[PDB]
Antibody, heavy 224, light 209 residues
Framework: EVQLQESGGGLVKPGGSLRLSCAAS????????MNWVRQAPGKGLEWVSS????????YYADSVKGRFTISRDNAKNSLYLQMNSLRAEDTAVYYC????????????????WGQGTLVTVSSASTKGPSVFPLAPSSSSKSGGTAALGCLVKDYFPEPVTVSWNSGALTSGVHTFPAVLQSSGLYSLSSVVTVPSSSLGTQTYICNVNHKPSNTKVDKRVEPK | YELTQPPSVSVSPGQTASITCSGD??????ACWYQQKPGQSPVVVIY???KRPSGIPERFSGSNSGNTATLTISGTQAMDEADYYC?????????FGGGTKLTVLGQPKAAPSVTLFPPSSEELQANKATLVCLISDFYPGAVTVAWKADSSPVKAGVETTTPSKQSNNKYAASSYLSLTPEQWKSHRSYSCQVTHEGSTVEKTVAPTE
């Protein structure tokens, strides 16, 4: 029914600075306490800071003390968050949220929330992967078979493609979605399950292609 | 101050889902509940322990007794599948629970298969070490992954994906532990522990093969 709209998010290097703003519509901005909340990708909600309409009561989470500053301009219907000395740990979607509760009764809640603005703190640049063999084992996927694979480590940006034996080996192949690491680089793994009797006779090669860095690796995966 | 929620609750369609949130003296505090669906902002579904915002369906209700706040969804529907967060104030600090993924079961539960790979000798020669824990074919799509150095927790170096949907509608995830060569060689073993629906699978690898 009423709306908050955040802006200012983007890509910033570690140690850099960024200023977020939030504009209100549908309610009188100057009548309410306002809050910032953030959420790292795949993680939970973490309150950042609060400010009363008068700006006379201001609170911060310990994780941002000394680095972030909350402020508001009631005449411009805007909330701000100045973010200094940014770290990779600060990568998150940042939400504006109104507290329409009763401060005197310590009866608070957040309604509405903005759509959020994404802050990415990263100095990653184009990087080709290191490719490492994952030597076969029959301890977890067996019954006459062995699992082997390739680790495609620390590349940027997406995507990478993986095939096995130039694409002639397809059954039993499981390529896992990449993880985005706190370093800002991606890693992924691809595994294939093969007959354990073939481990001595059949060569297995993972074909890794990373077009953004113009890198290709053909990694032989030999038994130990 | 913390609020503790179960990481995941699962319910058959039409059954009652109950999500709990425990906190010290939580009976003295007003509890709030938020629903968050993938790619969207949170929305308040309960505030002031029991009050339901207008537009929230009547099958949602809240309570706060015995120092646990409970979100109850009767006749749970597929559209109720989401993450739910409880929230309370502690001396001007705003505290959220860790979140509960509610799955409305569209198929029977499936236990994960777990494969753990040690660092390759090649990577160790490159003065690096990565352990790879691959988790597949589980449903609902919620797991807890914990790494162990010998029998002790790991304090840093873990990177775990959110579960993603496979072709067969089960879920997969992966976890990576980055170590120094000295850390790898100076422990008897490392372990990947995967917990799913209250059951745990633990795989262990050692430098001495």
């Amino acid at each position: 029914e009423v709306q908050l709209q955040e802006s200012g998010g983007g890509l910033v290097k570690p140690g850099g600075s960024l200023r977020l703003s939030c504009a209100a519509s549908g309610f009188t901005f100057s009548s309410y306490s306002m809050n910032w909340v953030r959420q790292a990708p795949g993680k939970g909600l973490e309150w950042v800071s609060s400010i009363t309409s008068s700006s006379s009561y201001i609170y911060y989470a310990d994780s941002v003390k000394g680095r972030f500053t909350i402020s508001r301009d009631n005449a411009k219907n805007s909330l701000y968050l100045q973010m200094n000395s940014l770290r990779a740990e600060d990568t998150a979607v940042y939400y504006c949220a109104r507290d329409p509760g009763i401060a005197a009764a310590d009866n608070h809640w957040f309604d509405p929330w903005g759509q959020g603005t994404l802050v990415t703190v990263s100095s990653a640049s184009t990087k080709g992967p290191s490719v490492f063999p994952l030597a076969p084992s029959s301890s977890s996927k067996s019954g006459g078979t062995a699992a082997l694979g390739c680790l495609v480590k620390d590349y940027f940006p997406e995507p990478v493609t993986v095939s096995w034996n130039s694409g002639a080996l397809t059954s039993g192949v499981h390529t896992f979605p990449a993880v985005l690491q706190s370093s800002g680089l991606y890693s992924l793994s691809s595994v294939v399950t093969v007959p354990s009797s073939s481990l001595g006779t059949q060569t297995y090669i993972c074909n890794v292609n990373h077009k953004p860095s113009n890198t290709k690796v053909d990694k032989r995966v030999e038994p130990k | 101050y913390e609020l503790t929620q179960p990481p995941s609750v699962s319910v058959s369609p039409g059954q009652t889902a109950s999500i709990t949130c425990s906190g010290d003296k939580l009976g003295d505090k007003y509890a709030c509940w938020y629903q968050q669906k993938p790619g969207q902002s949170p929305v308040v579904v309960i505030y002031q322990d029991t009050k339901r915002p207008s537009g929230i369906p009547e099958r949602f209700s809240g309570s706060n007794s015995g120092n646990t706040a409970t979100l109850t969804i009767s006749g749970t529907q597929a559209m109720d599948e989401a993450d739910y967060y409880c929230q309370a104030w502690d001396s001007s600090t705003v505290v959220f629970g860790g979140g509960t993924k509610l799955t409305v079961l569209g198929q029977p539960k499936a236990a994960p298969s777990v494969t753990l790979f040690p660092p390759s000798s090649e990577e160790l020669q490159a003065n690096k070490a990565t352990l790879v824990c691959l988790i597949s074919d589980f449903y609902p799509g919620a797991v807890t992954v914990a790494w162990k150095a010998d029998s002790s927790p790991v304090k840093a170096g873990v990177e775990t994906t959110t579960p993603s949907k496979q072709s067969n509608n089960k879920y997969a995830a992966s976890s990576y532990l980055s170590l120094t060569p000295e850390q790898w060689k100076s422990h008897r073993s490392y372990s990947c522990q995967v917990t799913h629906e209250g059951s745990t699978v633990e795989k262990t690898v050692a430098p001495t093969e």
